[PDB]
């Protein structure tokens, strides 16, 4: 059944699992036409598929060409997500295939269940957690590869950089969701925090800056402050 606050630590056991998030698959800008009607223009998207134990991110880039001539794109986007996740699973050796796939939005359950009928032993699960993975496009290097793509493409990342050399996967996921929640609540301030100090750089093969243990504690504290603030700035408290 559903993943929630009470079975949180199952994410860090030794059963392979993937989170799937489809919130950035179908993306548009809305604008006015010369006649003063409204129209959408699609921009490139991505499926966010994450192993929370290892940090491996399977970033499937959705090129706008996949929408050409199609109707009901928001419904199609859920099925295209399921089709790509199923193709990914089939591409993996049996011993790397997940035992569970956790979708971040309930609307993905039926599409994914149907595409995965060949894998009856893979559990498709929803979650009650309000995870901030929509903010993945606030990571500059992820946004950059999606926007530059000229064709469909899969790109592989470790979203934890080298953190697992020093911290556990539980702590690494807690850090990741804190950063992403901050970026979702106030992107500009969150990005200012992460990059205000020019002496701390992002390695070419990493996504985040090379903070020491002590600097991550200060960073993490600053992101909590930001989130709490915006919560007042918003609800006025």
């Amino acid at each position: 059944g559903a993943m929630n606050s009470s079975n949180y630590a199952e994410l860090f056991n030794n059963d392979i699992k993937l989170f799937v998030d489809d919130t950035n698959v179908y993306r548009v800008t809305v604008h006015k036409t010369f006649e003063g009607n409204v129209a959408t223009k699609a921009i490139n998207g991505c499926i966010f598929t994450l192993n929370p134990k290892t940090g491996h991110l399977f970033l499937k880039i959705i090129h706008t060409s996949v929408w050409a001539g199609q109707k009901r794109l928001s419904q199609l986007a859920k099925w295209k997500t399921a089709e790509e996740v199923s193709a990914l699973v089939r591409s993996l050796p049996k011993e790397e295939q997940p035992k569970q796939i956790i979708v971040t939005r309930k609307a993905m359950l039926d599409p994914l269940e149907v595409h995965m009928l060949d894998f009856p032993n893979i559990a498709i699960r929803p979650t009650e957690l309000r995870l901030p993975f929509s903010a993945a496009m606030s990571i500059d290097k992820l946004s950059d590869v999606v926007m530059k793509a000229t064709e469909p493409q899969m790109v592989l990342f470790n979203i934890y950089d080298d953190w697992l050399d020093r911290i556990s996967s539980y702590t690494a996921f807690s850090r990741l969701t804190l950063l992403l929640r901050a970026l979702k609540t106030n992107e500009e301030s969150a990005k200012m925090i992460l990059l205000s100090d020019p002496t701390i750089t992002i390695k070419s093969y990493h996504l985040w800056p090379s903070f020491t243990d002590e600097q991550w504690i200060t960073i993490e504290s600053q992101m909590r402050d930001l989130i709490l603030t915006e919560y007042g700035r918003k609800y006025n408290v």
């Binding site: 199609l76 099925w79 399921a82 089709e83 039926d110 599409p111 269940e113 149907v114 595409h115 009928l117 060949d118």
Partner: protein
């Protein structure tokens, strides 16, 4: 006309014959039911006055033999049986009529209700759902489970309904996942109609039979089957025109016949609202939609 005689009525029981029913007192001088229309299947059913648990009964066709009822005090129920000695059977029936010990199947001449509820039902196909090959009639009761229910435990005593499962490889063609799940026409027309039933009459026959077991015995797995067969048609964009017209007539009479007070358990809100308001066939069931809206507007 045909007759189903009763050896006796030793325990107080409510007796049903098709959509009719009457009460019989413990050891009342009751010897059966006469004037039963030939040409239709029928169901004779029972609810003991002492145990409203377990409604149970027998589907039969008068053309397939001479059948009678006899209470069994060991197994504690009214059992259907076949009399092979035809002479013995006419002699019995004639004596019981002469003494006027029988109730008359009470059909109004204008009244086509039973025909309209059983139009497509075949009795030889019913013996496939309720497998007991040594009898020509078929026992059903409230508690019997379906094959599909046993998958999700005694197979001898199960309802072998056609397995319908919308999230199954039978239902979904590789490479047409979204198409086949949102428009089930392939599954209705090719897998089920052409592949299993052979024709639409067999589809309506099982659908009519499932409904009647749900209504007369409160059989939960039968209600599931009735709603699934409805939903498969309503969720297909391409259905023969004659099938939709006939489905509308079928459902109309089922809704008309349902007890007003059982609507809350025999009717699945989700399927009906889909069929009448969201599905491809939302504008194709004019008679069913009108009786549903005038009789059970609460469900909608």
């Amino acid at each position: 006309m045909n007759t189903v005689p009763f050896t006796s009525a030793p325990i107080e029981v409510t007796i049903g014959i098709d959509q009719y029913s009457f009460n019989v007192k413990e050891n009342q001088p009751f010897h059966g039911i006469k004037d039963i229309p030939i040409g239709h299947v029928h169901v004779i059913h029972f609810q003991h006055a002492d145990n409203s648990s377990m409604r149970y009964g027998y589907w039969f066709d008068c053309r397939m033999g001479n059948f009678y009822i006899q209470y069994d005090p060991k197994d504690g129920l009214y059992k259907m049986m076949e009399e092979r000695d035809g002479a013995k059977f006419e002699n019995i029936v004639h004596n019981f009529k002469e003494r006027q010990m029988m109730v008359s199947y009470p059909k109004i001449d204008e009244d086509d209700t039973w025909y309209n509820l059983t139009e497509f039902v075949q009795m030889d196909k019913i013996r496939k759902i309720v497998r007991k090959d040594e009898n020509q009639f078929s026992y059903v009761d409230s508690s019997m489970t379906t094959v599909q229910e046993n998958e999700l435990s005694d197979p001898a005593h199960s309802l072998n309904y056609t397995v319908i499962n919308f999230k199954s490889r039978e239902a979904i063609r590789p490479g047409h996942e979204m198409e086949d799940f949102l428009d089930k026409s392939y599954y209705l027309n090719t897998v089920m109609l052409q592949g299993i039933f052979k024709n639409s009459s067999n589809y309506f026959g099982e659908l009519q039979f499932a409904f009647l077991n749900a209504m007369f015995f409160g059989n939960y797995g039968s209600s599931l089957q009735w709603h699934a067969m409805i939903e498969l048609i309503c969720s297909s964009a391409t259905v023969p025109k004659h099938m939709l017209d006939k489905l509308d007539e079928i459902l109309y009479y089922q809704i008309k016949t349902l007890p007003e007070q059982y609507s809350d358990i025999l009717l699945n809100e989700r399927v009906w609202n889909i069929c009448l308001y969201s599905s491809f066939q939302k504008n194709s069931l004019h008679n069913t939609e009108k009786i549903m809206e005038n009789k059970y507007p609460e469900l909608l």
